[PDB]
Amino acid sequence: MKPTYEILGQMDETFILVKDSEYLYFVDQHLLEERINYEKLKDENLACRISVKAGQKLSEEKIRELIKTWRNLENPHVCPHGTPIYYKIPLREIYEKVGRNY
Amino acid sequence: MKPTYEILGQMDETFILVKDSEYLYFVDQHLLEERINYEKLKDENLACRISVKAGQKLSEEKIRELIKTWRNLENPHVCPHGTPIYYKIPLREIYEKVGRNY
Ligand code: NA
Ligand code: NA
C-alpha cells in the first residue's frame, strides 16, 4: 500500500478499511496483530493468543497504529498460518461499474 | 438492501458506503440523487443538472437522507441513463478471503 492512504474505519469490529489511490483494503484486525506479534516474538502460538480478536471494537488511535505498522512488516500479506491478512478491491472496479473513469 | 443497515461514510467524495448483513454497497452520490430527482420530476436533464456531483463532500445528515430515500425508490438499481447506481461486494468474499466463515 502506498504511503499516502486514508483509513475509513472498522467494519463488523473485524476489518479495518483503508485505501490508497489504487485499492481499498479490508484488513483483518486479528491476522494483522498476529503478524505484528509474530515478527516480534517469532512464536506463532504466543502471537495468536495475545492478539486482538474479531468482535473487539478498536479506537481510532489503535487503528492508526496497526495500519502504520502493517506497512512496515516483513510479510504484510499473510499471517504465520498462511491466511491472507486482507481482501482488496481495485478502485477501478467500483468506478467502472457506475460508468466513471479511474 | 435490508432495512437494518450501517452507513460507513463517504469515499473519495463520490461514493457512500453502506452495508447490510449481505453486501457492502458503494453508492454513487450523483447517480442516486439523479434517480431521486428523476422519479420526482420525470425529467432526465433537469434531474441531472440539479443533483450533487462527484467531488462534493456531503454531511452525515445529507448522507442519511439519501440512503433512506434510496431504499424507497421505484428503481434503486440504475439511473435514468441506465448506469448502475452502485457497486456491491458480497460480504462473504471479504470474510472468506481471510479464512473466516460468513
Ligand atoms: Na509458544
Ligand atoms: Na428538461
Residue numbers in the entry:
A (entry chain A), B (entry chain A): 0, 325 to 425
Tell me, in the authors' exact words, what the paper reports.
Arg406 is a component of the CPHGRP motif and completely conserved in all MutL endonucleases including human PMS2 and MLH3, the nuclease subunits of MutLα and MutLγ, respectively. Arg406 of aqMutL corresponds to Arg847 of human PMS2. The R847T mutation has been found in Lynch syndrome-suspicious patients and registered as a variant of uncertain significance at the ClinVar database. The R406T mutant form of the aqMutL CTD was crystallized in the presence of cadmium ion, and the structure was solved with the Cd-SAD phasing. As was expected from the CD measurements, the overall structure was almost identical to that of the WT aqMutL CTD. The distance between the M1 cadmium ion and the W1 water molecule was 2.57 Å. However, the position of the α4 helix, the local structure around Thr406, and the quaternary structure were the same as those of the zinc-bound form of the WT aqMutL CTD (respectively). These results support the notion that the M1 cadmium ion fixes the side chain of Arg406 of aqMutL, causing the shift in the position of the α4 helix and the change in the quaternary structure. The DNA-binding ability of aqMutL was not influenced by these mutations, whereas the endonuclease activity was severely impaired by the R406A and R406T mutations. The R406K mutant form retained significant, albeit weaker, endonuclease activity. These results suggest that the Arg residue in the CPHGRP motif is a catalytic residue for the endonuclease activity.
MutLs, with a few exceptions, are endonucleases that incise the error-containing (i.e., newly synthesized) strand of the mismatched duplex. Prokaryotic MutL endonucleases and the endonuclease subunits of eukaryotic MutL homologs include two domains: the N-terminal ATPase domain and the C-terminal endonuclease domain (CTD). The dimerization subdomain contains the metal-binding sites, in which multiple zinc ions are coordinated by the residues from highly conserved motifs: DQHAX2EX4E, ACR, and CPHGRP (underlined residues coordinate the zinc ions). Here, we solved the crystal structure of the endonuclease domain of Aquifex aeolicus MutL in the manganese- or cadmium-bound form, revealing that these metals compete with zinc at the same sites.
